[PDB]
């Protein structure tokens, strides 16, 4: 049976890269998104992102470098309308209105969801515990928040994050202008997540490296003291625990390697979950804390705080962003 042989090949763990059924979806979508991204980043013509006939050039051939180049989001006139190639009268019209962005982000989001499913699938085929995909759900939720959920809440894929470095910075600055994300607790939890993730990464790495058991001489690298597949632990967990328990106090230190590695998984994953949820909840315009004119003296004069200085910076960004796109006093979306 050809179908049985195909099923055996798809689910085979002997392939150099595992495919699986999630990979059967993942490989074509990510290949399409990757090829279209490379082509658009090099050679796409300028895109009228704001829908006001003001095309923004994001490709290398139209005057960009690596830093300033981007795949520009689709037109504000399109909004949330589905804009495939066959909906356009020609490829010139599709390129003018930012169709490549919609193609890339839709294929990428599908392929990355199937990447998460593929991680589960391979863990199941290898007899592993299944929750690496749960850890990967945090950056995937972040990608969904900036590419899909924020355009949905704001009503246009033009407000999605551009596929570029300076476009990303533009997204960040305009987002702070419109939503005050720095004062949002979910973004603060995300900063705690990534700062703590970097801290605990450096901490765990330095504590394991500090307690490596002497297996080599002074000339060779210490990494040759570990052999792949060896049964014994390559470092002294008790010595690292003794060091770190004397560094703070005994009960702030993990003596359990499993609890420590669960904490290493859990802290940045939960923090990034919260910051992705912050982006989505601000997509429905539930913004960060507003303390403008909160402190008032006895007469009634406004006493400024640091929040008022942040408000001045946000006002500068707000009045300069998309400088020709607004006709009315309130930036309602």
């Amino acid at each position: 049976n050809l179908w049985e042989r195909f099923c055996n090949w798809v689910t085979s763990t002997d392939n150099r890269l595992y495919v699986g059924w999630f990979g059967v979806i993942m490989i074509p979508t990510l290949l399409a998104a990757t090829i279209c991204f490379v082509i658009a980043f090099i050679a796409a013509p300028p895109v009228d992102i704001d829908g006001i006939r003001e095309p923004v050039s994001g490709s290398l051939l139209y005057g960009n470098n690596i830093i300033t180049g981007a795949v520009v989001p689709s037109s504000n006139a399109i909004g949330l309308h589905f804009y495939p190639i066959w909906e356009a009268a020609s490829l010139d019209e599709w390129l003018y209105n930012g169709g490549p962005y919609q193609l890339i982000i839709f294929h990428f989001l599908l392929g990355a969801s199937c990447y998460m499913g593929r991680q589960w699938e391979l863990s199941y085929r290898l007899g592993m515990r299944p929750w690496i995909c749960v850890a990967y759900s945090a950056p995937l939720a972040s990608a969904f928040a900036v590419f899909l959920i924020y355009p949905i809440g704001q009503g246009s894929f033009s407000d999605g994050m551009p596929l570029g470095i300076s476009g990303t910075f533009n997204f960040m600055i305009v987002f702070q202008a419109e939503h005050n994300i720095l004062m949002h607790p979910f973004h603060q939890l995300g900063v705690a997540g990534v700062f703590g993730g970097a801290l605990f990464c450096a901490m765990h790495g330095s504590l394991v490296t500090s307690s490596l058991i002497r297996e080599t001489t002074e000339t060779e690298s210490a990494n040759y003291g570990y052999k792949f597949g060896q049964e014994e632990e390559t470092y002294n967990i008790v010595a690292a625990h003794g060091y770190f328990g004397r560094l703070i106090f005994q009960y702030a230190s993990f003596n359990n390697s499993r609890s420590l590695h669960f904490f290493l998984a859990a802290w940045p994953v939960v923090g990034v979950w919260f910051t992705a949820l912050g982006i989505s909840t601000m997509a429905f315009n539930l913004n960060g804390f507003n303390f403008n004119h909160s402190v008032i003296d006895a007469k009634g004069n406004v006493i400024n705080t640091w929040a008022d200085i942040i408000n001045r910076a946000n006002l500068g960004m707000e009045v300069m962003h998309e400088r020709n796109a607004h006709n009315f006093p309130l930036d309602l979306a």
Binding site: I296, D297, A298, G300
Partner: protein
């Protein structure tokens, strides 16, 4: 048994805890200040 009382741990605990409770009382009083 025969544990001591005034150790280094006692000093560290109280140098953190005594001003903490004092400051908490101060801020709790601040909550009832009008313009």
């Amino acid at each position: 048994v025969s544990y001591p009382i005034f150790t280094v741990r006692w000093v560290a605990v109280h140098t953190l805890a005594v001003p903490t409770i004092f400051f908490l009382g101060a801020i709790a009083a601040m909550q009832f200040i009008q313009r």
